[PDB]
Amino acid sequence: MAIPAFHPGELNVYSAPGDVADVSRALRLTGRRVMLVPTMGALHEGHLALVRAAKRVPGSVVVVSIFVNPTPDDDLAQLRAEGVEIAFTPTTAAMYPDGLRTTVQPGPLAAELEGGPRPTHFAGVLTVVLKLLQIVRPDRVFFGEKDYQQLVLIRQLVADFNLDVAVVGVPTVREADGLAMSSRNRYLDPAQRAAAVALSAALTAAAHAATAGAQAALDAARAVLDAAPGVAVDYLELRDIGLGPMPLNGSGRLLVAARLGTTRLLDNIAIEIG
Amino acid sequence: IPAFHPGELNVYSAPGDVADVSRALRLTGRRVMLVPTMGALHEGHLALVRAAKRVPGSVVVVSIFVNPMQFGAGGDLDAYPRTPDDDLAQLRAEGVEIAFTPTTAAMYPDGLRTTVQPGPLAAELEGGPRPTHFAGVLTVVLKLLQIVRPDRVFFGEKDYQQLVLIRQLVADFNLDVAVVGVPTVREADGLAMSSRNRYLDPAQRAAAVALSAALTAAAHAATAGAQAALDAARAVLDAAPGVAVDYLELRDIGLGPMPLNGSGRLLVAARLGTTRLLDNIAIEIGT
Ligand SMILES: COc1ccc2c(c1)cc(C(=O)NS(=O)(=O)N1CCOCC1)n2CC(=O)O
Numbered sequence: 001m002a003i004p005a006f007h008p009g010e011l012n013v014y015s016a017p018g019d020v021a022d023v024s025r026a027l028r029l030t031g032r033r034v035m036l037v038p039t040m041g042a043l044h045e046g047h048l049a050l051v052r053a054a055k056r057v058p059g060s061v062v063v064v065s066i067f068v069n070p071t072p073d074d075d076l077a078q079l080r081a082e083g084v085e086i087a088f089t090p091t092t093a094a095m096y097p098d099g100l101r102t103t104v105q106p107g108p109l110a111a112e113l114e115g116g117p118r119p120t121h122f123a124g125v126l127t128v129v130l131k132l133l134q135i136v137r138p139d140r141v142f143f144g145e146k147d148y149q150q151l152v153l154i155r156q157l158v159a160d161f162n163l164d165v166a167v168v169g170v171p172t173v174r175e176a177d178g179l180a181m182s183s184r185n186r187y188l189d190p191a192q193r194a195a196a197v198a199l200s201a202a203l204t205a206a207a208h209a210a211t212a213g214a215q216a217a218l219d220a221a222r223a224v225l226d227a228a229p230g231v232a233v234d235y236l237e238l239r240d241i242g243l244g245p246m247p248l249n250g251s252g253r254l255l256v257a258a259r260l261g262t263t264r265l266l267d268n269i270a271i272e273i274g
Numbered sequence: 275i276p277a278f279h280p281g282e283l284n285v286y287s288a289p290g291d292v293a294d295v296s297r298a299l300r301l302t303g304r305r306v307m308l309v310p311t312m313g314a315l316h317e318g319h320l321a322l323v324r325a326a327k328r329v330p331g332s333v334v335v336v337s338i339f340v341n342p343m344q345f346g347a348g349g350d351l352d353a354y355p356r357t358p359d360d361d362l363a364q365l366r367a368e369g370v371e372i373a374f375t376p377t378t379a380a381m382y383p384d385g386l387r388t389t390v391q392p393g394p395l396a397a398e399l400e401g402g403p404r405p406t407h408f409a410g411v412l413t414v415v416l417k418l419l420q421i422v423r424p425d426r427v428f429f430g431e432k433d434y435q436q437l438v439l440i441r442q443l444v445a446d447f448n449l450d451v452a453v454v455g456v457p458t459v460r461e462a463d464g465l466a467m468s469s470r471n472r473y474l475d476p477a478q479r480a481a482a483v484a485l486s487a488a489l490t491a492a493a494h495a496a497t498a499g500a501q502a503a504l505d506a507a508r509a510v511l512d513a514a515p516g517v518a519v520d521y522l523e524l525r526d527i528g529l530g531p532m533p534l535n536g537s538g539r540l541l542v543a544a545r546l547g548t549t550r551l552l553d554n555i556a557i558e559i560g561t
């Protein structure tokens with residue numbers, strides 16, 4: 001049948017999975033490399049940084065998905081401002097025309113860490129990321145490193161189901177005092193917002209303490225969080241980069257999550273032991 | 275790209291070799307057709323192959339891989355028939371160009387980790403007593419679909435619940451493949467092909483015609499309604515020596531949560547000694 005209209009150099013918006021699927025396939029056949037940036041709308045500078053990373057690939061056409069897995073005007077304007085040529089904005093019914101039926105079951109990592117208060121969260125994530133990658137068939141898909149467990153789970157999905165996409169993690173964009181960017185940050189009151197910096201300050205102190213070994217890094221991060229009031233830490237864990245157990249020597253990742261009033265914040269950093 | 279010699283049987287074990295050859299063929303215009311099998315090939319598998327070969331410009335990839343994740347445990351994996359030499363002889367005789375024969379380590383280098391969780395249909399019928407069976411099937415078929423990226427994938431209708439769940443997988447994860455169901459090839463008396471048929475002794479093989487005779491009596495009985503269709507099938511199964519019926523169920527064609535209307539599928543599973551046989555048929559009610 002006829003390819004949907006696509007106007008190069010402007011923001012083309014599709015809601016129908018089949019429409020974006022046909023346009024992506026037509027573009028790829030024309031010598032473009034399809035880049036997917038999955039979002040849930042409400043775009044912030046962290047999403048812009050995903051887009052800029054995608055746009056850097058020569059020959060790129062950038063597809064930004066906006067889907068809340070169960071404001072439009074402003075998101076699309078930001079996308080236009082960034083030179084993004086494709087926005088995919090499906091309804092829940094278009095993504096799930098048969099309801100919830102076959103789904104993705106993550107490996108046991110999805111039960112750990114975030115998987116504690118939210119046991120089925122990552123099955124949902126992995127299911128819609130899978131569907132997005134099958135609809136759009138991108139050459140590369142971009143995610144921020146803030147939701148680091150999510151990123152690892154995505155790389156396990158890609159390995160395990162033999163998907164033909166490159167997973168690109170982009171360093172977390174941070175506020176000027178280091179607080180990782182988040183939709184949730186606007187909910188903090190001024191005391192909570194001041195206390196919230198302890199997450200990024202604990203992890204950066206740990207990254208530097210790590211020359212003295214893993215225990216020093218963990219104790220430094222704990223002392224920073226202990227200097228903050230009304231920061232209820234859920235976990236502070238050193239793991240290897242794939243979120244297995246931290247090797248005695250080598251590269252790793254330090255992850256923290258805490259509740260400030262009603263707001264849950266997460267951060268993580270690269271750690272190099274000794 | 276490893277070597278590909280056209281009009282010869284090319285056998286690849288490494289998922290990256292078949293992926294590269296397939297993508298290269300697709301980019302030169304050939305449509306890639308996948309026939310996934312667990313080996314022990316019979317005439318029903320060759321009908322799948324012939325269906326695939328009829329697609330103009332096709333290149334046919336037949337996968338052979340006894341998938342450990344769909345077997346419970348209780349010796350079933352070890353006992354599955356393996357007939358590698360006859361399988362490859364048959365594919366050469368049919369003109370198949372690509373056989374894909376992955377090792378268990380190439381398919382599951384990290385063990386069982388991310389997997390497909392089917393919808394509720396997987397817990398019905400064959401999956402009632404085997405709750406993780408269809409998760410194993412749909413996980414492997416997804417990986418095979420990803421590695422080979424066929425235009426069309428071909429399955430027999432004999433394992434009809436499996437087929438319906440594979441269409442579910444395809445729709446639910448937006449896979450860009452067409453699923454082609456091919457009608458069950460049958461012995462001359464009607465017995466559905468199966469590479470479990472080898473475990474029927476001569477008495478069991480005689481008795482096993484009752485599954486097909488029961489289904490085809492039911493299809494004709496159906497002018498008189500669902501009860502007459504089921505009771506004709508039941509009568510034939512009951513007259514048969516040493517057939518133990520697991521289930522006999524008439525459902526809507528999608529086997530989903532909707533009542534039977536005009537078009538139905540009648541499914542049977544029965545044990546002859548230790549051998550469990552499946553069959554099914556299209557049923558039109560009245561009309
Ligand atoms: C490259 O730097 C970053 C930094 C933070 C990021 C991102 C990237 C991406 C996200 C993010 O959560 N994206 S989202 O689309 O899953 N969704 C945004 C709207 O609120 C819920 C999170 N976030 C966190 C967030 O927005 O809550």
Ligand SMILES: COc1ccc2c(c1)cc(C(=O)NS(=O)(=O)N1CCOCC1)n2CC(=O)O
Nearest residue numbers: 312318319321430432433457458459467468469
């Ligand atoms: C077109 O005619 C036919 C007839 C029967 C077929 C086929 C083709 C294909 C198969 C087959 O693929 N069976 S299976 O690998 O998916 N599997 C065998 C183990 O029992 C569960 C289904 N089988 C089923 C079988 O061999 O039992």
